[PDB]
Scaffold this active site. Structure first.
Site, PDB file in Angstrom:
ATOM      1  N   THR G   1       0.827  -1.200   0.000  1.00  0.00           N
ATOM      2  CA  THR G   1       0.000   0.000   0.000  1.00  0.00           C
ATOM      3  C   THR G   1       0.864   1.253   0.000  1.00  0.00           C
ATOM      4  O   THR G   1       1.638   1.484   0.928  1.00  0.00           O
ATOM      5  CB  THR G   1      -0.941   0.039   1.216  1.00  0.00           C
ATOM      6  OG1 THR G   1      -1.806  -1.103   1.187  1.00  0.00           O
ATOM      7  CG2 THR G   1      -1.780   1.303   1.198  1.00  0.00           C
ATOM      8  N   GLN G   2       0.729   2.062  -1.048  1.00  0.00           N
ATOM      9  CA  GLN G   2       1.496   3.293  -1.164  1.00  0.00           C
ATOM     10  C   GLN G   2       0.705   4.533  -0.776  1.00  0.00           C
ATOM     11  O   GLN G   2       1.313   5.535  -0.385  1.00  0.00           O
ATOM     12  CB  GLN G   2       2.015   3.461  -2.596  1.00  0.00           C
ATOM     13  CG  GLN G   2       2.994   2.387  -3.028  1.00  0.00           C
ATOM     14  CD  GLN G   2       4.245   2.367  -2.178  1.00  0.00           C
ATOM     15  OE1 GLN G   2       4.467   1.437  -1.403  1.00  0.00           O
ATOM     16  NE2 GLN G   2       5.071   3.398  -2.314  1.00  0.00           N
ATOM     17  N   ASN G 104       5.922  -3.230  -0.073  1.00  0.00           N
ATOM     18  CA  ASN G 104       4.483  -3.073  -0.288  1.00  0.00           C
ATOM     19  C   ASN G 104       3.774  -3.208   1.052  1.00  0.00           C
ATOM     20  O   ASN G 104       3.034  -4.167   1.289  1.00  0.00           O
ATOM     21  CB  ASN G 104       3.974  -4.113  -1.286  1.00  0.00           C
ATOM     22  CG  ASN G 104       2.575  -3.817  -1.784  1.00  0.00           C
ATOM     23  OD1 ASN G 104       1.966  -2.812  -1.421  1.00  0.00           O
ATOM     24  ND2 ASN G 104       2.051  -4.706  -2.618  1.00  0.00           N
ATOM     25  N   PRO G 105       3.951  -2.239   1.945  1.00  0.00           N
ATOM     26  CA  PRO G 105       3.605  -2.439   3.355  1.00  0.00           C
ATOM     27  C   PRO G 105       2.105  -2.321   3.606  1.00  0.00           C
ATOM     28  O   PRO G 105       1.321  -1.973   2.726  1.00  0.00           O
ATOM     29  CB  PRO G 105       4.361  -1.310   4.049  1.00  0.00           C
ATOM     30  CG  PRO G 105       4.353  -0.219   3.046  1.00  0.00           C
ATOM     31  CD  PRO G 105       4.456  -0.876   1.701  1.00  0.00           C
TER      32      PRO G 105
END
Lengths: 199, 220, 213, 204, 201, 191, 215, 199, 191, 215
Positions: G1-2, G104-105
């Site tokens: 999540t960006q 892609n945290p």
């Protein structure tokens, strides 16, 4: 940065290079060799990056010798030159492009002597003379001035000595020594080394 | 850096701390952040240290020029108008965050000044890096028209909440009490942090350092 | 956009004795201008003769600790013995280089006893080069501790002073004095001092309080 | 950075009735030294010195501009300058170049001209004064100099032990620095005399 | 960081400093920058700490297997070539490596120079490091092929001292190895401050 | 920030929230977003805080000096012209959301709108601020020509409270003001 | 999540004598717009442990989906075992650390409260895999605001009863309404005991505005 | 890029430079002079940009001669050197910064010979020897090896010849000729030009 | 683009504008912004046009295949779960504003909201699209619990027309739909 | 002006037999929000020439202020002279060219219609100082949409009456309502004759939506 020359004769090919292996200010080695005996009548000159010169040209060196041992005879200088162009163009649109500049010198029993030019974008040419490096600019118009298609092998050495004294005069890099080969119907003969007492 | 102010039933109590840092290294263990303006007005400084020092001396020089020409006591609204008109001209380049407080004929007045030139009249303000910690102590425990020692206890409680947050102080909690007639100023009001004792022998010997060349020059 | 690294502070000290090893660290965990906790020691008892310290990014410190503790069991059931002090430093150098192009943001110091019964301190870098030293100080206050220990332990820049080896009791008060002076000028250091002593009789622990600001 | 272009280290330390100041000797570009006799401590009247560290241009520039204003001050008034007065003079000179600033950090050490009272202070690159009672340091290797002075300083010290403390503080901290060294000069002044000594340091 | 190597009639001389820094901060003063690969081979450390430490240890892992499979030591030109091909596969990814390879061979002495960029050259004299350019001039003024053994020890010890004098990233101690026909031998290890009292006096 | 202005038959009705924020932190919890210029002319400000406070001091200086020379009460259209001459001139430097309203003896109640650009236009009702986008559909379905004063105080109280429902730059407390020929009635609404 | 679209805000938590209390509000703001006024941000795990979270809410529904499955997967075995509150804190840290290593945290910040074997538990989980234990926790702006109020009482008095702890949370939740721009005046309080997980309804605050009559 | 040298003696100053005026590959001029006679006992060496060398150093050249004609006597080498530092530092924080590197050589009747170093950031120094350019790296440690504070003027020329042969050996640029001056109590004497037969 | 969904006692009521724009040019002047999935379940889409058309085809493929196996009418909550499993999985690639509504025999009328993030929540009424920000203050001051069907058709007609007042991504024509147990009544409103 | 805040839209204009007609709408949009629904974008200069503009509206009030002053400044002389419509077109071009040379332009696009000495006049003024004359003009998106409808009729019939011209503008203003996202269904029509400048009221359009019943 480093220099090559490609004087072609009626039955001989006169080639020479420099002997400098400098590192960004210093000159680490002053007897470096850039001449690769591909076969008994074909040489190879290579100018380019740090690792790309040794890795690619030895890949060609140990692949023409495979053709000699397996088929019993030797490649022509035309077919050997047109195989080197195949390997750059196939390995150009990939993650590892090779950035080297070449010129090939060979003698044929049926076609006589031959010279080929090579870009770093794999473009073949058939030239009566060629050069590379920054010194290619200052020297080839001298060689364009006095060239004759019917010239002896003794005047070609004298024309080569005229070609290198102006590179000693108006070129900023040092370049003291220049090794010289010659290729004829007998094979590759090693001529004497060329050095310069400057003043 | 944690500064705060409050208005009790008779005057204004200011508070600050005693640390200036360079990078993440404590440069000073005892720095004065409460500055003199007039015999009724003081001002706490926050932000760039040399910007707050050279600003608070110029305006204090103009009010000394103003009141001695006038012949009466200055007003806090005059020092409010000089600061926000100067800082607006520099377009926020001078980084100065000030808490202005004093007692006039009209009574006590407390202001908060931002380095672009926006001013707010409030009964209690906090500025600085640890202003978030000190403000939570106020809103939990502020009530209007407190007494003298009740208001002094609230400020020293609120400053200490920022000291036990990061960028606190080599703590010497400062207080400046401004009333209608009496003026107080207390540098060592509370020392909660102490340096431990040195338990090692560090006997420097008389001659344990080699000297190449000596030189003697007398005086008079 | 997303950034994968952050600095958490910490200070680790190790001293190799003649027949002992002392590992010390603070218990303050911080980020930016906030304090997460005042109780988070950096000492980790790997074996009965080896204690490791981990500073830097705290998320990699929790990961790298559990990888080493897994490989201690993987060594033992394959070899019917425990690792030495020098074997762990050789194993850790391969683990740190294994992520060369996405490195751990961890400074490491291993202190403990060798197979001869003497002290041994190995210092590290975030890519995996190491050497055996007598004393190192890693972490945020690393520059404030190395010149003083050169004077007292290494006896550098001193004249007419004999080289007596450091005893155990003299080494305890040198550790207790450097962290008081370091907590004054550094902001990432304080709130406690966990001290682990590794001898031939086991591992002792001791906690000394510091200033709480 | 710009401060790390030439290196430097200036330390001052307060004693009982005396005050000491010390600096390094190395002059050089980023990794190449030039000479080992670069002056960084300048006398401004008797019993009152100043030390400069930072960019080597602004070291020689500010020390001439301050000397320009000091001699005009000491002729309009027959007295000498007080140590508090010089600190206000330097802070005025740095703040005039608020957005074109000089890259140096001055350190002022000296005695009172009437009494024996010592004085130490240091300033930022834009003129923030900061007086202490134990020591002030400035230069590139600042963090190493805090580690030595917080452990070795004693409150009331004779000129014998004050010299030995500032010697061990400068030698052990600058040898940890890479871009500073090549000799350390130490000035120790008092009411009666001024003593200048140079130390035997590592020349690597 | 300053290393040098030169070969002559009686073998190869290897010398280096011992200072490793981190920005403007000196990490240590006792860094052993000459990695002992074999009892008959030596390698240097110049540029990158773990990069020169890992790949030469991997080369020492490879030369031992070559000895067991073929009952013969590896040659000097073979080991420098194997190191050049391992680094070339990571070209452009950001390695730093400028080591040298020394050792006796059946052809005699051996001295090659390997970069992380891909330069593999032979030669007689070399000097690698940040303060390497200060060491070429003082070495070549005194270099000869027919120098004595005690004379060659004093030449390399002088040349490291002049390099650590002008450079800021060079200092500590001066290590000195000697490659004999049977194998290498450690000569000495001298402090720079001890040489300053000897040379200036 | 949400500001509001509605004229009626007698005069005008103003209203605003307080909540001076920075980032996601409220700096000032209760705020006079409406400012007296003359005895009959107010303005409510939006945008940068330091910019609008500097402009409102200069207009009060210029208009207050100008009415003493004429010995007449100033016009509301005269005051709205002075904000136009500064916002249009010093554009690309200021972020101001000034809405000018007030009673005038020649014309009665007037409401002018000077947005961030620098234009000037008279309106029947006017909104502004960051939270004004959320009540644009409510304010035109509810408005009706020919209101009394007590309807407009009821109108702007419900209109602000919907923008002040939760929206992060708005809320706090409601400050209302009614300007007519008699006087100025200001009140603070909560609960 | 960006890019976190729909985010939450500060979540509180503090231990007491035989239990852990956790409170958070019910707001689903999108940037500055408060789009969702009625959501639940506290998940009741089986009988002893309990989870509240901040950050992105779409990522929270994913972890609500996965943690809900794993608890069912053990209860169907019926071997007399369950997840301890410390084991959930161990699994969740390895889930977050392995997710950020792929760049892609998960945009979350999570607080785990649990009570097992007569022992309270209060754990913190960061987006970057930073985890620790504490007697009091606060996320977001609450780490700047309610956290000094938490540590002040716990140093003057180390242990607290249930009524002392619950009254102290309502004081801190009152404060965050005054100065957090993403606060919401309707929250819920969850509490673990030896009796199990209990979640109170949508409680409200009591505000003071007497300083508005001042100038 | 171009080279300077600053050998200081007990009663003399030995200075030398190169004679190259190259343009990016070619060498347009091989007898260029970089030596500026400021007065009867003070020289000037200037290394820098294209136009900044000639414009600034002649501004100093035609300003020291003004002091000689107006006051009847001559500047000391110390005061002349400390005036050049004043003009860079005043014209540094402006729209036209001068990017040159200098070294000054002067003899005094009361102070003897003197040498001064100059950066492009206007930093003075008092050095027993100095150099500039990329060749300053390879040559000064040779000069650091054999220097003696009490050295004769004949050994200094021999030490200068040792200093330039290694620049002929391991430096990539050509640099064939080197003009040499000497300054003593009598004035500026011009020594013979130094050239190199390379091979 | 402005979409609308209100449930009532019987079922739900949907509504949308048309005006598919690009830049400042209307490409499509009349547009079916609401799409049938099953006989009782609709969805109204917002965001990128090519993204939402690809998702609505896949969900109709998966849900239409799934109900034939069970031999049962599908649940509305089942359909809203399938949009969540694609929007949350393929985030950073799609911009979808899906609102799912429809009647179900087990539960009656339901309205779900799946914004650009990927979360799922049940609501009483739901708005969406670019022009939905302008009627947020009107829609909660007008809504009342316990409406009939004819009130909700009156409710969404006035609610859309305020967002469709002038706003450049909205307007055109009103398409309404009512879903109940009996059938689906769709109508087009103009004038 | 670097950032136009409140902008207009397309302005039309076409000659006929003895006059020029110009029409534009009454919208004050800010980006996508239509903030101002009732403004006038056509200025009546004294008796023969006439101005309508597009682009930034705050810049248009500035030129309304300056052009309004210059006309008064000549009428007070009373020397029997006035500005021709071509002289206004000459002055306005030099005002725009001198403004862009300082890199601080006026965000406008202006159409000048005038009728003097029995001759019609229709001039175009760009932001960048590009000016010309034409029998029909259209700005903004109208140069893509209404401009092919203008040139089609004027080539099949070179001259037009007043009723033929006025009916043709209402057809083109109807079209721009369908496909311009910044259009507005309330516009005004201005016309110069030999009798003077006359501006009609807020007229509206008549739309068709019979293709909505198709699929």
């Amino acid at each position: 940065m480093e220099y090559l020359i490609g004087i072609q004769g009626p039955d001989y090919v006169l080639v020479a290079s420099d002997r400098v292996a400098a590192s960004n200010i210093v000159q680490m080695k002053d007897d470096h060799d850039k001449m690769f005996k591909m076969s008994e009548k074909i040489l190879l000159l290579c100018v380019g990056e740090a690792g790309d010169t040794v890795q690619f040209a030895e890949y060609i060196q140990k692949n023409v010798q495979l053709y000699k041992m397996r088929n019993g005879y030797e490649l022509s200088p035309t077919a050997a030159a047109n195989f080197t162009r195949r390997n750059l163009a196939d390995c150009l649109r990939s993650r590892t492009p090779y950035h080297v500049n070449l010129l090939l010198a060979g003698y044929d029993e049926h076609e006589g002597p031959a010279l080929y030019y090579m870009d770093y974008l794999a473009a073949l040419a058939k030239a009566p003379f060629a050069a590379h490096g920054y010194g290619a600019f200052l020297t080839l118009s001298i060689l364009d001035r006095y060239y004759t298609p019917t010239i002896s092998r003794e005047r070609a050495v004298e024309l080569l000595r005229k070609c290198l004294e102006e590179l000693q005069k108006r070129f900023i890099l040092n370049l003291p020594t220049f090794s010289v080969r010659i290729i004829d119907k007998n094979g590759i003969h090693d001529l004497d080394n060329i050095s310069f007492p400057k003043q | 850096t944690t500064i705060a102010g409050v208005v009790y039933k008779d005057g204004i109590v200011l508070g600050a701390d005693t640390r200036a840092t360079e990078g993440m290294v404590v440069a000073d263990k005892n720095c004065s952040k409460i500055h003199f303006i007039s015999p009724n007005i003081y001002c706490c400084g926050a932000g760039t240290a040399a910007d707050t020092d050279m600003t608070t001396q110029l305006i204090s020089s103009n009010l000394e020029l103003h009141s001695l020409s006038t012949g009466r006591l200055p007003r806090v609204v005059t020092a409010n108008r000089m600061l926000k008109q100067m800082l607006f001209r520099y377009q926020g380049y001078i980084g100065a965050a000030l808490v202005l407080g004093g007692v006039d004929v009209t009574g006590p007045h407390l202001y908060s000044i931002y380095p672009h030139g926006s001013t707010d009249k409030l009964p209690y303000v906090t500025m600085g890096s640890g202003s978030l910690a000190a403000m939570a102590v106020f809103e939990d425990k502020f009530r209007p028209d407190m007494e003298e020692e009740e208001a002094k206890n609230l400020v020293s409680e609120a400053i200490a909440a920022g000291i036990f947050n990061d960028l606190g102080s080599g703590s010497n909690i400062d207080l400046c009490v401004i009333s209608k007639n009496k003026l107080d100023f207390l540098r060592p009001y509370t020392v909660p942090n102490k340096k431990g004792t040195r338990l090692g022998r560090y006997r420097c010997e008389k001659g344990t350092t080699a000297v190449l060349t000596e030189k003697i020059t007398p005086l008079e | 956009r997303f950034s994968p690294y952050v600095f958490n502070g910490g200070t680790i000290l190790a001293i190799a004795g003649e027949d002992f090893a002392i590992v010390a660290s603070d218990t303050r965990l911080s980020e930016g201008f906030s304090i997460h906790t005042r109780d988070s020691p950096k000492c980790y008892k790997l074996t009965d003769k080896t204690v490791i310290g981990c500073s830097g990014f705290h998320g990699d410190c929790l990961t790298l600790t559990k990888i080493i503790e897994a490989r201690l069991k993987m060594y033992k059931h394959s070899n019917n013995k425990a690792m030495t002090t020098g074997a762990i430093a050789a194993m850790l150098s391969t683990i740190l280089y294994s992520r060369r192009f996405f490195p751990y943001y961890v400074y490491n110091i291993i202190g403990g006893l060798d197979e001869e019964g003497k002290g041994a301190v190995y210092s590290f870098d975030p890519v995996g080069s190491y050497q055996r030293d007598s004393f190192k100080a890693g972490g945020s206050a690393s520059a404030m501790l190395q010149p003083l220990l050169d004077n007292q332990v290494g006896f550098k820049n001193m004249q007419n002073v004999e080289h007596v080896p450091l005893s155990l009791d003299r080494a305890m008060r040198l550790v207790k004095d450097v962290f008081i002076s370091a907590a004054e000028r550094d902001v990432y250091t304080g709130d406690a001092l966990r001290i682990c002593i590794v001898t031939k009789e086991g591992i002792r622990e001791e906690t000394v309080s510091l200033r709480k600001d | 950075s710009i401060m790390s272009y030439n290196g430097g280290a200036v330390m001052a330390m307060k004693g009982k009735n005396c005050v000491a100041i010390a600096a390094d000797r190395r002059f050089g570009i980023q990794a190449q030294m030039v000479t080992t006799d670069f002056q960084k401590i300048f006398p401004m009247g008797d019993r009152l010195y100043i030390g400069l560290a930072g960019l080597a241009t602004d070291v020689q520039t500010v020390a001439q501009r301050l000397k320009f204003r000091l001699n005009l001050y000491e002729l309009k008034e027959g007295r000498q300058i007080k140590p508090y007065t010089l600190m206000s003079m330097v802070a005025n000179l740095l703040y005039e170049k608020r957005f074109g600033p000089y890259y140096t950090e001055p350190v002022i050490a000296g005695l009172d001209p009437k009494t024996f009272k010592p004085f130490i202070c240091s300033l930022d690159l834009i003129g923030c004064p900061m007086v202490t009672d134990d020591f002030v340091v400035s230069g590139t290797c600042a963090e190493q100099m805090y580690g030595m002075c917080e452990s070795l300083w004693e409150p009331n010290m004779d000129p014998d032990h004050l010299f030995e403390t500032i010697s061990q503080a400068m030698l052990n901290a600058v040898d940890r620095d890479a871009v500073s060294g090549m000799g350390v000069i130490v000035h120790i002044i008092e009411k009666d005399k001024i003593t200048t000594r140079t130390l035997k340091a590592r020349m690597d | 960081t300053t290393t040098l190597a030169f070969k002559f009639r009686h073998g190869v001389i290897v010398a280096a400093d011992s200072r490793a820094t981190a920005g403007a901060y000196i990490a240590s003063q006792t860094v052993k920058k000459v990695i002992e690969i074999n009892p008959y081979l030596l390698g240097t450390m110049a540029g990158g700490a773990a990069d020169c430490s890992f790949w030469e240890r991997l080369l020492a892992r490879q030369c031992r297997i070559y000895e067991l499979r073929n009952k013969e030591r590896i040659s000097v030109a073979a080991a420098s070539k194997l190191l050049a091909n391992m680094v070339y596969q990571y070209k452009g990814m950001g390695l730093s490596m400028g080591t040298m390879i020394c050792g006796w061979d059946k052809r005699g002495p051996g001295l090659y120079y390997v970069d992380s960029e891909g330069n593999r050259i032979s030669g007689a004299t070399f000097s690698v490091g940040s303060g390497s350019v200060y060491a070429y001039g003082v070495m070549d003024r005194g270099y000869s092929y027919d120098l004595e053994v005690e004379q060659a020890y004093d030449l390399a010890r002088r040349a490291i001292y002049q390099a650590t004098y002008r450079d800021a990233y060079s200092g500590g101690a001066v290590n000195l190895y000697h490659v004999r026909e049977d194998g290498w031998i450690r000569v000495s290890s001298d402090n720079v401050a001890d040489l300053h009292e000897k040379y200036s006096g | 920030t949400t500001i509001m202005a509605v004229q009626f038959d007698g005069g005008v009705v103003l209203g605003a929230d307080s909540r001076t924020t920075t980032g996601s932190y409220i700096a000032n919890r209760v705020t006079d977003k409406l400012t007296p210029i003359h005895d009959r002319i107010f303005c409510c400000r939006s945008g940068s805080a330091a910019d609008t406070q500097a402009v409102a001091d200069a207009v009060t200086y210029q208009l207050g000096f100008h009415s003493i020379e004429l010995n007449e009460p100033p016009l509301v259209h005269t005051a709205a012209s002075l904000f136009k001459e500064m916002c249009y001139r010093y554009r690309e430097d200021l972020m101001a959301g000034i809405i000018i309203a007030g009673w005038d003896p020649q014309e009665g109640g007037q409401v002018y709108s000077v947005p961030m650009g620098g234009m000037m236009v008279r309106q029947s009702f006017a909104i502004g601020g960051s939270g004004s986008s959320y009540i644009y559909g409510y304010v035109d379905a509810t408005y009706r020509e020919g209101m009394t004063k007590e309807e407009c105080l009821q109108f702007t109280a419900n209109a602000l409270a919907l923008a002040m429902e939760r929206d992060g730059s708005s809320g706090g407390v409601i400050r209302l003001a009614a300007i007519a020929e008699s006087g100025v009635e200001r009140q603070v609404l909560l609960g | 999540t960006q890019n976190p679209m729909v985010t939450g805000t500060s979540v509180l938590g503090v231990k007491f004598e035989g239990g852990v209390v956790i409170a958070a509000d019910m707001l689903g703001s999108y940037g500055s717009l408060a789009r969702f006024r009625n959501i639940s941000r506290i998940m009741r795990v089986n009988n002893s442990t309990m989870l509240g979270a901040s950050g992105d809410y779409a990522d929270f529904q994913y972890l609500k989906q996965v943690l809900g499955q794993m608890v069912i997967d053990e209860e169907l075995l019926g071997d007399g075992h369950s997840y301890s509150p410390r084991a959930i804190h161990s699994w969740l840290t390895r889930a977050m650390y392995s997710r950020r290593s792929k760049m892609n945290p998960l945009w979350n910040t999570m607080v785990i409260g649990g009570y097992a074997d007569g022992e309270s538990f209060l754990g913190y989980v960061d987006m970057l895999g930073v985890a620790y234990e504490a007697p009091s926790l606060a996320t977001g702006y609450g780490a700047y605001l309610a956290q000094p109020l938490l540590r002040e009482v716990l140093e003057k008095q180390p242990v607290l009863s249930q009524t002392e702890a619950r009254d102290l949370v309502e004081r801190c939740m009152r404060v965050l309404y005054y100065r957090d721009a993403r606060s919401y005046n309707r929250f819920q309080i969850a509490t673990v005991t030896e009796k199990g997980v209990e979640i109170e309804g949508p409680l409200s605050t009591e505000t003071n505005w007497d300083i508005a009559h001042m100038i």
